[PDB]
């Protein structure tokens, strides 16, 4: 039911993207689409099926391609995830990526809350003890350190995707379906 107009998204979200751009040296490999010729990495599109970068995200905000702000968050993490996948853990570009992600995680919650959401945190806080997703880079002995996306429940009334753990509590029941605060 809630529709987000482009200028409302751009106004709220763009300062989170500028916070990334401000990071120097860290944003510099993220400022333009990876060019595997220039960078000497001819196997790049063998590994990254769905590239993403700061300029494409800015252009998506600037031209109204996101309908709702979790689509922006998903692209931010697709960019991060691509880079943590392709580059080795010891590489400069990987380490820069982790810094950008730290910066993002600290910026996104207040801004998502200004847009009516619970928070802006994509991934669960830790892996589940053992007994895809638009940001997961696709693929055509393990180690238990994967973080899955925090699952959602939609507000029945406005259509906002809210996290189950942010809005559903152990002592509250919603027989007619979840409704968010304001809306309520």
């Amino acid at each position: 039911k809630k529709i987000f107009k482009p200028e409302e998204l751009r106004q709220a979200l763009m300062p989170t993207l500028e916070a990334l751009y401000r990071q120097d040296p860290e944003s510099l490999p993220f400022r333009q689409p990876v060019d595997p010729q220039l960078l000497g990495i001819p196997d790049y599109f063998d590994i990254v099926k769905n590239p993403m970068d700061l300029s494409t995200i800015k252009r998506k905000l600037d031209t109204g391609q996101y309908q709702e702000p979790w689509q922006y968050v998903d692209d931010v993490w697709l960019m991060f995830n691509n880079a943590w996948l392709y580059n080795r853990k010891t590489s400069r570009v990987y380490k820069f990526c982790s810094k950008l992600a730290e910066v993002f995680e600290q910026e996104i919650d207040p801004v998502m809350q200004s847009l009516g959401y619970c928070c802006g945190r994509k991934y669960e806080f830790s892996p589940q003890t053992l007994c895809d997703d638009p940001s997961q880079p696709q693929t055509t002995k393990k180690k238990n350190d994967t973080l899955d996306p925090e699952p959602f429940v939609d507000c029945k009334e406005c259509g906002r995707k809210m996290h189950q753990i942010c809005v559903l509590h152990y002592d509250i029941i919603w027989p007619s379906g979840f409704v968010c605060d304001n809306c309520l």
């Binding site: 490999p29 960078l39 000497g40 990495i41 001819p42 196997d43 790049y44 580059n87 080795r88 590489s91 570009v93």
Partner: peptide
């Protein structure tokens, strides 16, 4: 496997 050069 290549690396950013």
């Amino acid at each position: 496997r290549h690396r950013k050069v």
